[PDB]
Structure 1
Amino acid sequence: NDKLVELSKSDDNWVMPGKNYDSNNFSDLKQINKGNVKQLRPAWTFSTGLLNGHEGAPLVVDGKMYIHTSFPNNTFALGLDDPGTILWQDKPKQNPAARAVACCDLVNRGLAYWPGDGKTPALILKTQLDGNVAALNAETGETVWKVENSDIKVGSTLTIAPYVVKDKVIIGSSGAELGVRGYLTAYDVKTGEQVWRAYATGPDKDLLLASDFNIKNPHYGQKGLGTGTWEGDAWKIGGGTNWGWYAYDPGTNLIYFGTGNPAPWNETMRPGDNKWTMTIFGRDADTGEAKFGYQKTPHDEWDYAGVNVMMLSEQKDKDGKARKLLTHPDRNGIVYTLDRTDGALVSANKLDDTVNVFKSVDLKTGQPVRDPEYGTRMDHLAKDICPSAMGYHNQGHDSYDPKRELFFMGINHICMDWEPFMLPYRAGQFFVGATLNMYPGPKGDRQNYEGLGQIKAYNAITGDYKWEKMERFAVWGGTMATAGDLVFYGTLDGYLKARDSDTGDLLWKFKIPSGAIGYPMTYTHKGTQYVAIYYGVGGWPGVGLVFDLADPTAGLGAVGAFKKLANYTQMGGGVVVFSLDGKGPYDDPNVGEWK
């Protein structure tokens, strides 16, 4: 938009997931710096009234705070002058049959904002888990239009956040575990009519490829690979759903995203290359035609998912030429960086030195080098597969510091054992399956099931890490960097921690009612800086506490891995807002009382 960028520049607003179109989560505020961090105490808090996982961050626009929820998908609007009063609320009525189709937990990942032209007022864009998309008035709270994008009966669930580009809103899809073909849709933001829609597998008509697809790098693939790489009509149920984060560039007018894993989970039933699955796409916005696509893991057999966050930057390469780049972590233990204009590959590095599923990645051809010993399809027990199906990264939102040129990220430390088996039965009937176990890695403590996390600062061009530090459980969430030598993050123990940018030493930690799986955000109201975060535990690591399970093998082995989380935290949900010295709106006690 020609107006949302200017709103993004100001320090009083948080307009979109990622705070800007580069998705770097960087603020330029220095009122809270290393001189004064010991005085960070809470200012005010609210409780949603729900007991599940809370993901994402609130929105702060023109003196108002917008808060979203878990399964009922409620929405609240609050005024920053008098937080205790609720301006308006939206509580939908929905069939309680969509809980049986959710993969892992009832979650949502944010809202969207549209400023509007002179005629149509500003709008708030919202998605429901049933498969509905709605637009609400930002000042009163009615409904202008509402449509449907997913079908519950087939098994399509929608938990991704909307994303607004120019005059259009982009919607994704989820539910690949049930064998749902993935697609991306664009809608008009004023009325609700459909503009374009694209798929991941099938005939080239459905994919909407451009006439110059991958012209700079012919060895990635040109045409006819959406059906040829599959055998038969498997691509109708192939999968490849995107449920992560987007990026946008106005100069190239491009949208960048990724795609998920194929279906079914058995690699023998789908023999081929499974093209345009787990692929980085850069597409156009007005027509939706694809400009480039790169494959990371061809013919996956460990159940990974490349739908992580991508971060745009501008840096000078080894030869000294300035270039525009995108950086992308992945679940297989490799972080990639690519050219934003044509799609050339600059570097690919290893997250940790204990990865043994890939020996290296060849830059000239783009094909990774595999280790046969630590692979599946070996027909017997396989030991010490690092990383596991959870991966070293997930749906969190890392941070980027441009003045220092560093990436701040949180990494898991989990390893897996795979045991296949086959059991016969009466009349030509056999059952094939796999038992999976997860456990801490070599640098942790396997006896006591602790030491399952790390936090690191990384440089892409050189490849070396400035510092790395250890944690108790995984950092299921994101980080956020400020102007003055500071980074913030949250932990499933129920802690908010503030660290040091150049040395990594611990500087501050506080305890919140429940563990956090979101990312912190910051803003200013009137000469005062506030830092806000959600609380409420859930997601994949919290599946054993939400449903009260005791079998170690439940949840593919997540119950066994996180068996010690029960004696550190419980469920909850809400928002907490911190400030220096805890000063806030109610400093004078005679504000907001009756008469």
Structure 2
Amino acid sequence: NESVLKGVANPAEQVLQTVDYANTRYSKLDQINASNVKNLQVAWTFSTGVLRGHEGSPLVVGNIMYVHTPFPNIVYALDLDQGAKIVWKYEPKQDPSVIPVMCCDTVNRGLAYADGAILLHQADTTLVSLDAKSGKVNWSVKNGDPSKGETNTATVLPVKDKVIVGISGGEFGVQCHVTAYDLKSGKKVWRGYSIGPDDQLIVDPEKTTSLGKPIGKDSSLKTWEGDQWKTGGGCTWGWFSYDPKLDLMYYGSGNPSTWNPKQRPGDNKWSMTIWARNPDTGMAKWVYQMTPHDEWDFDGINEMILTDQKFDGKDRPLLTHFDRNGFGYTLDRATGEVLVAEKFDPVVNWATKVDLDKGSKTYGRPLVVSKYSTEQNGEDVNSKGICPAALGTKDQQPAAFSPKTGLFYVPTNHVCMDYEPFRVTYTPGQPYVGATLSMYPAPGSHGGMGNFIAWDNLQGKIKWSNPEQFSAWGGALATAGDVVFYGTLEGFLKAVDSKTGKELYKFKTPSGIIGNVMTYEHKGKQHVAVLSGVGGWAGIGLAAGLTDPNAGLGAVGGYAALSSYTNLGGQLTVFSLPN
């Protein structure tokens, strides 16, 4: 919306979960700089009344802060003039059946503001637009049916007069889509599936290119055996970016449903693909599959940070992506030409590299290593030693970009995985996994499960990296004060230097941070705030109370020591300078 573009241009507000349309997560405020964030103190706190996983980050537009929760996805409107008093509250009624039909915690990844309306995508696949000053329902539409195993954990994307939302359910045999609804009306405009025939992919067979060449007719179904594409996966629970100068919406599709690969023959397109669609029509100008025929649930849902950089001496519209598979992709966001595809974790071993010799015949395909390939070892056989784990080198936690240092501050994971798949029959509403997993820290390092690194995407190199005991599940935020903020799973809110990376601030929030750092300015004073409350898929053992080491799809036993540092939470901590 133009409202959204109006809000981005004002740095004192946060109208998008991704800070800006480009998902740079870059703040122009420089009051809290690299030489005074040592002197940061807590401004005020606020609790949500909700436990389990608090992902995302609160909105502020003007003098009202909008806070979201996990299930049942309550929204609080806090009047900053009234001392964070709750102006209005919207607690929606949703059925508790929806929670066992969520793979990956009750998490919700936040709100969006557009044209005097707050838009919330509930866990039961319900897109609601609330009045920004009232909290009254303008309209409400159900995007999917959790009956069939379809939930939502992601946020919305408001573009012009439309709102494009995603759907989750990769672990439940859902064939998925990215759907746009009218801002004022709530009426469905178009729906572009990740999988299926060309008419609901919204693809042009002769004009939409992948790796420069047109994808042709029946691009999806040529890689699927029979009607397994209807149970085909490829869902959309990540962040979406948008370029107004190119009129293109960018997202990534998730896993090809089942975790057993020989039961799932073919390239399984278009799962695990960078998508670039039109906002009004929904049909894609270009696309690119990063992980053809996924064997490890390396969901390509992660944010695509849109940059304008100089590549090879020529200024080029760029798109940078940190996939779970372990490769930091740099792409032309206009053509789709894959420029850089290097590893941002040196212990990743499932592929030697991504083949980028333009005439290599394996062009654009990662060279899968035979020893770390779950299908080549076969069903009912344990694939030991795969790095990264199924949660990937980096999961939902969004990376930040600073246009002044030109680097990408990405919070990563340092865990690996034992993998053993097996055949499972699909049943609607039930899990469609087919794998027993067990995770552990990376074997040849400092024993920690995470790293906060800076990334040069124009050459594919790690400039510096800060190790962390547990993973770095908190979203990063870079600001013009040459500081980068991020939250750890022991409850720490850390601020480091933009170039050097040395820790400058460290504060213990009440629970582990899986949310993203935001900042705002109220009455001329800059405040930065972060949501606490551990969960997601790194805290699934604490969120669901799981005790078995193999439960939680392998992550419950891997993060066993996490309960020595934190419990469940649901608090928002706001920071500022003393002035």
TM-score, shorter chain, exceeding 0.5: yes
Normalised TM-score (structure 2): 0.93
Mapped to 1, the partners of 2:228 and 2:337 lie a distance apart of 30
> Which of the numbers 454, 460, 480 marks the counterpart of 1:463?
460
Amino acid at match of 2:38: K
2:109 pairs with 1:112: no
Mapped to 1, the partners of 2:436 and 2:21 lie a distance apart of 42
- Report the counterpart of residue 395 of structure 2 in structure 1: 394
Pairwise CA RMSD: 1.9
The alpha carbon displacement at 1:216 in A equals 7.9
- Report the counterpart of residue 529 of structure 2 in structure 1: 532
The alpha carbon displacement at 1:59 in A equals 0.7
The alpha carbon displacement at 1:421 in A equals 7.3
Mapped to 2, the partners of 1:420 and 1:135 lie a distance apart of 41
Amino acid at match of 1:396: Q
Mapped to 2, the partners of 1:382 and 1:148 lie a distance apart of 40
2:541 pairs with 1:547: no
2:464 pairs with 1:472: no
Native 8 Å contact 1:212 1:291 kept in 2? no
Secondary structure, aligned partner of 1:97: helix
> Which of the numbers 314, 322, 325 marks the counterpart of 1:329?
322
Mapped to 1, the partners of 2:349 and 2:490 lie a distance apart of 29
Native 8 Å contact 1:444 1:452 kept in 2? no
Secondary structure, aligned partner of 2:51: coil
Cα 1:308/1:575, change in 2 over 3 Å = same
Secondary structure, aligned partner of 1:100: coil
Cα 1:357/1:29, change in 2 over 3 Å = same
1:425-462 deviation line (CA, Å, top 9, x unaligned):
xxxxxxx96432211113446xxxx5111111111113
2:233 pairs with 1:239: yes
1:175-217 deviation line (CA, Å, top 9, x unaligned):
1211111012111111222211121222222222136534584
Secondary structure, aligned partner of 2:294: coil
Mapped to 1, the partners of 2:535 and 2:352 lie a distance apart of 34
Mapped to 2, the partners of 1:6 and 1:420 lie a distance apart of 49
- Report the counterpart of residue 193 of structure 2 in structure 1: 199
Name stretches of at least 5 consecutive residues in structure 1 with no aligned partner.
Answer: 116-121, 424-431, 584-595
1:150-195 deviation line (CA, Å, top 9, x unaligned):
1122121122211100011112111121111101211111122221
Mapped to 2, the partners of 1:421 and 1:290 lie a distance apart of 35
Mapped to 1, the partners of 2:86 and 2:3 lie a distance apart of 28
Secondary structure, aligned partner of 1:315: strand
Cα 1:345/1:434, change in 2 over 3 Å = closer
2:51 pairs with 1:51: yes
- Report the counterpart of residue 560 of structure 1 in structure 2: 557
Native 8 Å contact 2:258 2:434 kept in 1? no
Mapped to 2, the partners of 1:452 and 1:575 lie a distance apart of 25
Native 8 Å contact 1:173 1:242 kept in 2? yes
Native 8 Å contact 1:220 1:294 kept in 2? no
2:194 pairs with 1:222: no
- Report the counterpart of residue 593 of structure 1 in structure 2: none
The alpha carbon displacement at 1:219 in A equals 4.6
Mapped to 1, the partners of 2:184 and 2:512 lie a distance apart of 38
Cα 1:11/1:84, change in 2 over 3 Å = closer
- Report the counterpart of residue 430 of structure 2 in structure 1: none
Name stretches of at least 5 consecutive residues in structure 2 with no aligned partner.
Answer: 425-432
Number of residues of Structure 1 aligned to a counterpart in Structure 2: 563
Amino acid at match of 2:183: V
The alpha carbon displacement at 1:471 in A equals 0.8
Amino acid at match of 1:418: Y
Cα 1:471/1:79, change in 2 over 3 Å = same
- Which of the pair has more CA radius of gyration? 1
Amino acid at match of 2:405: R
- Report the counterpart of residue 118 of structure 1 in structure 2: none
Same amino acid, percent of matched pairs: 51
Native 8 Å contact 1:173 1:183 kept in 2? yes
- Report the counterpart of residue 376 of structure 1 in structure 2: 374
- Report the counterpart of residue 357 of structure 1 in structure 2: 350
- Report the counterpart of residue 507 of structure 1 in structure 2: 504
The alpha carbon displacement at 1:281 in A equals 0.9
Cα 1:45/1:356, change in 2 over 3 Å = same
Cα 1:433/1:297, change in 2 over 3 Å = closer
1:223-246 deviation line (CA, Å, top 9, x unaligned):
222222212121121121111001
Native 8 Å contact 1:74 1:90 kept in 2? yes
2:33 pairs with 1:40: no
- Report the counterpart of residue 516 of structure 2 in structure 1: 519
2:333 pairs with 1:340: yes
Mapped to 2, the partners of 1:254 and 1:187 lie a distance apart of 16
2:288 pairs with 1:290: no
Amino acid at match of 2:408: F
